C-alpha cells in the first residue's frame, strides 16, 4: 500500500493481521536500492542509530493491528516499510507483512509530458504492431496508464514500466488488423487528480 | 550494675481451682503452680534510693488483666442482637416516697427459632420502659463462669531481681535501708474496687500514707493500714437461673422469678475498726503535712456512678454503695466518738469496661442470699483544695484507675536487670 506525507507531519503505517494473543512486532525499513534494515523489535525497542521519532504500537490490545508511527518525517524517510509479527497464539510467520511505501511530498504538481506513436511501417511490414506511449518530466512518481480502442477499454496486450526517476513508458501490442479496424486508439495517463488523453489513428 | 524498666513478667498460681470461674481460668491459662521458698537475703548497704510510682510494671499488670478480660469475652459472650425495646411494668400498687424502680420485671418478644418466630420471654433492666442500650451492651452469660479474684504470684522471670524495698517507714521517693532481691511475689489478688481497697495486704507496723506528690491535690493519696476494717455486704435479692436454648445461635437467660421484696442490696461497716484506722489516719496526716488543723471528710464530688460510689465486685455482679457513712466526720483535733455504720447499696449487671468498645452485662444472677464479708485493707483519697483561713483540710474519696490499686499492692516491687 502507499502512504504519502508532507515533511514535518506525522505518518502512521499499519501492517499485518489483527492481533490474537500477546505479541512481538518487529519493523523493518527498506530504502530504494538497499537491503531491508531493522527499525524496531519487541514492539517499541530500537537498535542503536534509530531516532526516537519512530515508535511502534505495543503488543497490547487483542483484535488491533500493528502500527508504526513516524513523527516529524523528513525526505530521508521516503522508503518501503515492512513488519514481522510474532504472536503467542499464531505460528512463526516466514513471510513478512506486506510493504507500505512512504512517499514524502516535498515538491508538488509537476505534470507529465506525454508522447504517443503509431506502429512503424517496418513493424507493419513484419506483420506486427506496437503503439508506444511515453511519459516524462513529472513529479511525484505515481502514474496510472490505461488504453482504449475507440471508446472501449483495452483489456489485453498493455505493458507498462514503473516510473523511475521520473519518466515511464507504456506499450500496447496489436496486430495490424486490430490497429486498422478501429477509427483510433487512446492512451490515458492519470497523474495527481487529473487525466491526460493522447490519441492516435490509422 | 543494676538497670531498670523491662516489660517481662512470669505468672505463678494454682492449688485447688481448675476451669469455670474466670480468674481460675486466667491462672490456668497464664500461670503454672507456685514454688514457695523466698530467701530474699538483703545485702548490706546497697544504695538508699527508690521511687514507687514511676514503675511501668504497674501498667504491665493492669493492661494485661484488661487483655485477659477481653480474652474471656471471646467465646461465650454475646455482642448482639437482642437489645431493642422493653415492655416493663412496676410491681408497686400503693406508693410512698415516689420510689419508681432500680429493678423491674419486664417482658420482651424475643426471636426464638426458625424464621421470624418470637415468644414472650422475661427480662430485667435498670431504667424504665422502651429505653434500650446505649451504643452497645455485650451479654456475658456463659454456662460455666463465676468471678472471685485468685492470687497471681507475679515473678521476675529468669535471673532478674524484683528488688524489694522492705522499709516499714518509706517515703515514696525516698531512701530505703533494707532492700532485698526476690524471684516471685507472695500472690496479689486482682481487685477492682474504687475508694477503698478490699482483700489487699496490711502494713507491717502502723498506718502508712503515701502520695506521688503530697503537695499536688490532683495526685491520689493511698492509705495502707496495720489493721483491717470489717465490711459485710449481704444481698437477699432472689433469682432462679433459667437458660432457654431454642435456636442453635441464640443463647439467653430468664431472670426475675420468685419473690422476696428486698430493700435494694445492703452493706454494713463495723465502725469499731473504722474509728481506729481513720483516727490513726488523721494522726498520720497531722504528723506529715497538717501539723495543726481540723481534718474533715466529705463524700464523692460527683461524676459517673463508679466515681461517686464505693463500687466493687461481690461475684461478677457489680455493686455501688453510698459513700456518705464513710466520709461524714469533721475530725476535730482532740477526741472521737462511738456507734456503728450501715450503708445503702445498689447492684447492676451492666458495666462499662475498657474505654467505649462496649458495655458488658453479667445478665443472670444465680440464687440469692449471697453475702460478701470482706476486709477493707486500704483507702484511696484526694484532697479538696482549700484556704489556710478556714483552719481545716478536707479529703474526699478518690480513684477509679486500677493502676493505683495495683500501685498499692506493688508498692514494694521493682524489676531490674543485672550486668557486670
Amino acid at each position: 500500500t502507499f502512504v504519502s506525507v508532507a515533511p514535518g507531519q506525522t505518518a502512521r503505517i499499519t501492517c499485518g493481521e489483527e492481533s490474537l494473543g500477546s505479541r512481538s512486532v518487529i519493523w523493518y525499513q527498506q530504502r530504494p536500492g538497499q537491503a531491508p534494515s531493522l527499525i524496531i523489535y519487541n514492539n517499541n525497542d530500537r537498535p542503536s542509530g534509530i531516532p526516537d521519532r519512530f515508535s511502534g504500537s505495543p503488543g497490547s490490545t487483542f483484535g488491533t493491528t500493528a502500527t508504526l508511527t513516524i513523527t516529524s518525517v523528513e525526505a530521508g524517510d521516503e522508503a518501503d516499510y515492512y513488519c514481522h509479527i510474532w504472536d503467542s497464539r499464531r505460528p512463526t510467520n516466514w513471510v513478512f507483512g506486506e510493504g507500505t511505501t512512504l512517499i514524502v511530498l516535498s515538491q508538488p504538481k509537476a505534470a507529465p509530458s506525454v508522447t504517443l506513436f503509431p506502429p512503424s511501417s517496418e513493424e507493419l511490414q513484419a506483420n506486427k504492431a506496437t503503439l508506444v506511449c511515453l511519459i516524462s518530466d513529472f513529479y511525484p512518481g505515481a502514474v496510472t496508464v490505461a488504453w482504449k480502442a475507440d471508446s472501449s477499454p483495452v483489456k489485453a496486450g498493455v505493458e507498462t514500466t514503473t516510473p523511475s526517476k521520473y519518466a515511464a513508458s507504456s506499450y500496447l501490442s496489436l496486430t495490424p488488423e486490430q490497429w486498422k479496424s478501429h477509427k483510433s486508439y487512446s492512451c490515458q495517463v492519470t497523474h495527481e487528480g487529473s487525466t491526460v488523453e493522447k490519441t492516435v489513428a490509422p | 550494675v543494676w538497670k531498670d524498666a523491662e516489660t517481662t513478667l512470669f505468672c505463678a498460681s494454682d492449688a485447688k481451682a481448675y476451669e469455670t470461674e474466670k480468674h481460675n481460668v486466667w491462672a490456668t491459662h497464664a500461670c503454672v503452680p507456685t514454688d514457695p521458698n523466698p530467701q530474699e537475703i538483703h545485702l548490706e548497704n546497697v544504695t538508699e534510693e527508690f521511687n514507687m510510682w514511676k514503675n511501668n510494671m504497674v501498667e504491665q499488670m493492669h493492661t494485661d488483666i484488661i487483655s485477659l478480660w477481653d480474652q474471656s469475652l471471646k467465646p461465650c459472650v454475646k455482642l448482639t442482637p437482642l437489645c431493642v425495646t422493653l415492655q416493663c411494668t412496676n410491681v408497686t400498687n400503693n406508693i410512698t416516697d415516689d420510689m419508681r424502680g432500680e429493678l423491674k420485671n419486664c417482658s420482651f418478644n424475643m426471636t426464638t427459632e426458625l424464621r421470624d418466630k418470637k415468644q414472650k420471654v422475661y427480662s430485667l433492666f435498670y431504667r424504665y420502659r422502651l429505653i434500650n442500650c446505649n451504643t452497645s451492651a455485650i451479654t456475658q452469660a456463659c454456662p460455666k463462669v463465676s468471678f472471685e479474684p485468685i492470687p497471681i504470684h507475679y515473678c521476675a522471670p529468669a535471673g532478674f531481681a524484683i528488688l524489694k524495698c522492705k522499709d516499714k517507714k518509706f517515703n515514696g521517693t525516698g531512701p530505703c535501708p533494707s532492700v532485698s532481691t526476690v524471684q516471685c511475689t507472695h500472690g496479689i489478688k486482682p481487685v477492682v474496687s474504687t475508694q477503698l481497697l478490699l482483700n489487699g495486704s496490711l502494713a507491717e507496723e502502723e498506718v502508712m500514707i503515701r502520695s506521688e506528690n503530697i503537695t499536688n491535690n490532683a495526685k491520689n493519696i493511698l492509705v495502707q493500714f496495720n489493721t483491717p476494717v470489717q465490711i459485710n455486704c449481704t444481698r437477699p435479692n432472689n433469682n432462679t437461673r433459667k437458660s432457654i436454648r431454642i435456636g442453635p445461635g441464640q443463647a439467653f437467660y430468664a431472670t426475675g422469678d420468685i419473690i422476696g421484696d428486698i430493700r435494694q442490696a445492703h452493706c454494713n461497716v463495723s465502725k469499731a475498726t473504722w474509728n481506729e484506722t481513720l483516727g490513726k489516719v488523721v494522726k498520720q496526716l497531722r504528723k506529715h503535712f497538717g501539723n495543726n488543723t481540723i481534718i474533715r471528710f466529705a463524700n464523692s464530688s460527683g461524676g459517673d456512678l463508679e466515681v461517686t460510689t464505693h463500687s466493687f465486685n461481690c461475684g461478677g455482679e457489680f455493686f455501688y454503695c453510698n459513700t456518705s457513712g464513710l466520709f461524714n466526720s469533721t475530725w476535730i483535733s482532740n477526741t472521737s466518738v462511738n456507734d456503728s455504720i450501715t450503708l445503702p447499696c445498689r447492684i447492676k449487671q451492666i458495666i462499662n469496661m475498657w474505654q467505649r468498645i462496649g458495655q458488658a452485662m453479667y445478665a443472670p444472677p444465680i440464687q440469692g442470699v449471697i453475702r460478701c464479708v470482706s476486709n477493707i485493707t486500704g483507702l484511696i483519697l484526694t484532697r479538696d483544695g482549700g484556704s489556710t483561713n478556714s483552719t481545716t483540710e478536707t479529703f474526699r474519696p478518690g480513684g477509679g484507675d486500677m493502676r493505683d490499686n495495683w500501685r498499692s499492692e506493688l508498692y514494694k516491687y521493682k524489676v531490674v536487670k543485672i550486668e557486670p
Partner: protein, 226 residues
Amino acid sequence: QVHLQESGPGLVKPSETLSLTCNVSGTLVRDNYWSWIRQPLGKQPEWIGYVHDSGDTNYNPSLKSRVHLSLDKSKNLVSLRLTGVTAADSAIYYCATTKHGRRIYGVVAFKEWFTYFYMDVWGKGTSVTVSSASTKGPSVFPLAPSSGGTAALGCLVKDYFPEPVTVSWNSGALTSGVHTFPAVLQSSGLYSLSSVVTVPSSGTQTYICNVNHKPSNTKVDKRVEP
C-alpha cells in the same frame, strides 16, 4: 563493524540447485544465529530459515524438502543450498545476523511466553534469476518523427534476453534531450525497451540509434527518418 557479503551464480536453470555463500567478518559464525531471507521483485521479504552451530535450526515449511542452510567455522562463513528451483525462486537473497529475544510474562501467562527473532545486520544481497533460455538477441524498429517544432524521434528495441541492452545515439555525439526508457519484462519472459531523442523539426543532421546486446553479441545501427 560486523560485515556480511553474499555471493552466487546470478543465473540458474530450472530444477538445478541454487547455491550461495555468505562470507562473514567482524564476528565469528559460531557466536551468532544466522538467517537466509530473500525478497522477490516488488514483493515483501520471505524468511528462508535460521541456523545455529548448536543445531538450533529450523526452516520455512514450504521449502523444507528443498532447502539446506549450513555453517562453516573454519572458513568463518554461512551457506545456503536450494534444490529444484523454478522462476518462483527468483529473488534477491540476503544473509542476516539474527538476534534472538524473548517475551516473558507472569507464570499465569506461561502459555503466552514465546521466543522471537529479529535480523540486526544484513548483507547487500545476491540477485538470483531462474529462467530457461541460453540467449536471445533483439529486433530494432525505428520510431520516425512527425510533429511539434521540436519532435520526438526514436527506436523501439524488442524481444531480447537477458538484460541489459545499451543504446547510444550518433555514436555518442548526441546526449542532450536523449532518453532511453527502462526495459519492460513482457509475459513471454523476454525484455523490450524504447529510446528517443528530442530534436528540432528543420532537419540537417542524420540520426542513428546504436543498439548493442553483448549476451547475444549483436550490434545494430538503425538510421531513423521521417
